[PDB]
Amino acid sequence: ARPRSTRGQVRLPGGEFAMGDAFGEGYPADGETPVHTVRLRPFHIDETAVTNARFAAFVKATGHVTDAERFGSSAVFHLVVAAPDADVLGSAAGAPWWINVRGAHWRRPEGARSDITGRPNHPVVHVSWNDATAYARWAGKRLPTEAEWEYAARGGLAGRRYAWGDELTPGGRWRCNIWQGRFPHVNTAEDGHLSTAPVKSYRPNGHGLWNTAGNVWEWCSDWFSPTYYAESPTVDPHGPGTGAARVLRGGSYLCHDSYCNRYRVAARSSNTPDSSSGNLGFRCANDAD
Ligand SMILES: [Ca+2]
Numbered sequence: 001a002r003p004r005s006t007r008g009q010v011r012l013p014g015g016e017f018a019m020g021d022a023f024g025e026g027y028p029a030d031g032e033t034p035v036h037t038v039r040l041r042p043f044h045i046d047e048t049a050v051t052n053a054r055f056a057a058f059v060k061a062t063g064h065v066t067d068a069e070r071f072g073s074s075a076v077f078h079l080v081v082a083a084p085d086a087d088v089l090g091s092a093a094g095a096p097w098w099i100n101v102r103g104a105h106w107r108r109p110e111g112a113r114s115d116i117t118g119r120p121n122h123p124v125v126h127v128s129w130n131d132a133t134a135y136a137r138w139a140g141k142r143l144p145t146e147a148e149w150e151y152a153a154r155g156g157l158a159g160r161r162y163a164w165g166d167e168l169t170p171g172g173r174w175r176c177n178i179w180q181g182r183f184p185h186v187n188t189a190e191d192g193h194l195s196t197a198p199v200k201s202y203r204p205n206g207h208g209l210w211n212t213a214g215n216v217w218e219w220c221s222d223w224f225s226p227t228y229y230a231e232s233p234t235v236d237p238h239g240p241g242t243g244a245a246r247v248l249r250g251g252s253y254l255c256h257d258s259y260c261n262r263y264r265v266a267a268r269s270s271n272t273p274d275s276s277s278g279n280l281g282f283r284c285a286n287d288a289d
């Protein structure tokens with residue numbers, strides 16, 4: 001436990017909120033219901049997802065090798081692949097818009113022919129749950145619990161669909177980075193961004209958190225279970241004791257209503273802890289006092 005650091009974090013009061021899909025419109029397999037009352041002690045949470053600049057200081061200081069560098073490849077969205085054809089290990093099965101690209105990792109997130117020199121303030125991607133919790137440890141932080149993330153993401157509002165309210169595009173304007181157009185072939189970039197956006201795009205929510213909806217998925221501490229909500233403690237729920245996949249929240253720049261609207265503040269997803277991809281990052285937290 002390195003010397004605790006609240007740099008770039010806001011302190012949120014905590015208290016009691018209604019966690020879950022207040023509209024019963026979610027995906028049944030994800031267990032967004034029942035809406036259940038949770039009580040959180042005050043905590044800190046990152047204002048933004050972790051940046052390339054910050055994650056790079058972590059690697060410079062610890063020589064950490066990310067799971068995507070060990071496995072040898074990470075998933076890249078097919079429209080933005082920037083690699084020699086030798087490196088394309090072919091479409092991922094079950095979702096052919098994801099190309100397994102050899103050499104694709106956080107420093108070269110579209111493949112061997114890309115860099116992140118122009119994107120220090122973009123969220124870091126190609127980071128697994130292991131890479132995420134490693135960084136947090138080194139940085140004097142931890143990952144948020146799922147409940148901490150949703151409460152922080154709701155921004156002091158109760159029972160809303162999104163971090164800012166219930167209209168997806170208030171005033172007919174975009175305030176988050178997801179997908180527009182015909183997925184997976186055409187992205188019209190109405191929201192300003194094809195792939196990742198800078199961490200402080202648009203505007204923060206009620207608690208000061210930028211881009212909890214969209215941009216990239218965000219690792220949480222919990223194991224995923226679609227029945228945790230109906231069995232949850234009331235105080236500081238940490239998730240079930242074991243599981244198959246760790247929780248992801250927020251959605252990403254690929255989310256679209258046609259197949260995955262998980263940018264809803266109550267939507268949930270998961271993935272195996274050593275998974276990485278070009279739309280998956282994280283933000284840290286910490287206890288208070
Ligand atoms: Ca977009």
Ligand SMILES: [Cu+2]
Binds near residue numbers: 062063064134
């Ligand atoms: Cu390490």
Ligand SMILES: [Cu+2]
Binds near residue numbers: 078185186
């Ligand atoms: Cu296409």
Ligand SMILES: [Cu+2]
Binds near residue numbers: 197198
């Ligand atoms: Cu952009």
Ligand SMILES: [Cu+2]
Binds near residue numbers: 251254260261262263
């Ligand atoms: Cu989605």
